[PDB]
Design a protein around this ligand. Structure first.
Ligand SMILES: Nc1ncnc2c1ncn2[C@@H]1O[C@H](COP(=O)(O)OP(=O)(O)O)[C@@H](O)[C@H]1O
Ligand SMILES: [Mg+2]
Length: 399
RNA sequence: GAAA
């Protein structure tokens, strides 16, 4: 197996992408390095799968070994990493000030905005990790229903971050708060999209009253890439609902310029460039990535294999329903057209007005519909259904 | 974000 050795000076990153076919293994063999804010352990072997795009950054200097076939691999001397560090530094300063002002203190809340493929999710992740590394537990809010790093696509979610992200597997998705939107873009139903993140914000505000460390941890809010048209007023409502202190605009000067005139004067607005290592992804790639996210939801990762159950449910034992006038519930009769669709297990016990603004327990996928036997087969993360009320998502998956 |  073929090996590549890289010497990184201080403030450089090794940018590489694993091949189309094979894995690439990475090992820090000298110095200190981090991958999107998580510290690498000396001499540990991190196996990344095909098509991964990764940057290992060092503040002090590093020597790194890559084993396996790469599509690209190079050391970059210029990065915006200090910018990202300074935003974290600034956040922690606000925390101290507010803690001292509370002899309960509320941490800073930061909204990241900008178009797709600017490294927004990556920055969110760096910022969450740096807070954890500072001793804090931030709440990561994920409003991107398309490319969601917390739950399945078609959801709006939040997780309390208590551990740095796993280098390979991202953050722990333990006990998130998940709302089912049911579409991959907000433009499919914008009034429902706003209702859901408004209920996210209110729910979060109540939950943090019972948790001092989460309250002072603050929020890092990742948004989707829809910054034009109605997408724009939606950024302003999200900044309002979550009472954000800071808006970070990534690589969009007109957007930065427009928010500067509309946001309240107390809201700090910063424009940062995208990293030279962010690469543009096609729709085929993002579609494939939505699929892998679904697969992960049920089957977990290589390091943490999850073992889901495939069992039959009677149509008499459940109620199928669908949201969408934009915010009305509709009872669905079992049909062949629900095959391959995700369904959310609602926390509402009855199919009524409560379903809309209720978070969900989790998701199943309908694999078979047996109309003659009046049963469906579902793939499910647990043994028995946690709720009898099943809410439709337009997201489909072939297992 | 998603669609073409
Ligand atoms: N500095 C970097 N070097 C190499 N790859 C990167 C870097 N920053 C981000 N990436 C990769 O680029 C892709 C897009 O990044 P992402 O944060 O998802 O962008 P956005 O969320 O704005 O669409 C991801 O695969 C990510 O791992
Ligand atoms: Mg993103």
């Amino acid at each position: 197996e073929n090996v590549q050795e890289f010497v990184l000076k201080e403030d450089c990153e090794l940018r590489f992408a694993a091949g189309d076919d094979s894995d690439v293994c990475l090992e820090l063999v000298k110095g200190y390095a981090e991958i999107f804010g998580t510290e690498l352990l000396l001499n540990k072997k991190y196996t990344f799968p095909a098509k991964s795009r990764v940057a290992a950054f060092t503040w002090k200097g590093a020597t790194i070994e890559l084993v396996g076939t790469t599509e690209s691999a190079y050391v970059a001397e210029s990065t915006p990493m200090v910018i990202y560090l300074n935003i974290h530094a600034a956040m922690e300063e606000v925390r101290k000030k507010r803690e001292e002002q509370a002899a309960k203190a509320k941490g800073p809340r930061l909204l990241l905005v900008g178009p797709t493929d600017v490294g927004k999710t990556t920055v969110s992740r760096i910022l969450c990790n740096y807070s954890v590394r500072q001793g804090r537990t931030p709440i990561f809010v994920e409003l991107d229903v398309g490319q969601n790093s917390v739950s399945v696509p078609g959801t709006v979610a939040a997780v309390l971050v208590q551990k740095t992200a796993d280098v390979i597997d991202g953050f722990e998705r333990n006990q998130p708060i998940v709302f089912n939107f049911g579409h991959t873009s907000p433009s499919a139903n914008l009034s429902l999209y706003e209702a859901l993140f408004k209920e996210m914000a209110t729910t979060l505000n109540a939950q943090i009253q019972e948790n001092d460390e989460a309250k002072i941890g603050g929020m890092i809010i990742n948004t989707c890439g829809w910054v034009d048209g109605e997408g724009y007023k939606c950024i302003v409502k999200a900044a309002s609902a979550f009472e954000v202190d800071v808006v970070i605009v990534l690589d969009h000067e007109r957007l930065y310029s427009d928010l500067s005139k509309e946001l309240p004067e107390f809201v700090r607005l910063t424009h940062v460039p995208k990293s030279g290592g962010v690469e543009q992804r096609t729709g085929q790639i993002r579609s494939k990535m939505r699929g892998e996210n679904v697969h992960r939801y049920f089957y977990g990762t290589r390091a943490n294999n999850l073992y889901p159950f495939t069992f039959d449910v009677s149509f008499d034992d459940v109620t199928l329903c669908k949201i969408g006038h934009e915010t009305k519930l509709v009872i669905m009769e079992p049909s062949a057209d629900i095959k391959h669709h995700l369904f959310a297990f609602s926390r509402s016990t009855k199919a009524d007005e409560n379903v809309l603004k209720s978070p969900v327990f989790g998701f199943c996928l309908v694999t078979e519909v047996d109309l003659e036997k009046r049963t469906m087969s579902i793939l499910c993360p647990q043994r028995t259904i946690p709720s009898k009320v099943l809410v439709f998502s337009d997201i489909t998956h072939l297992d």
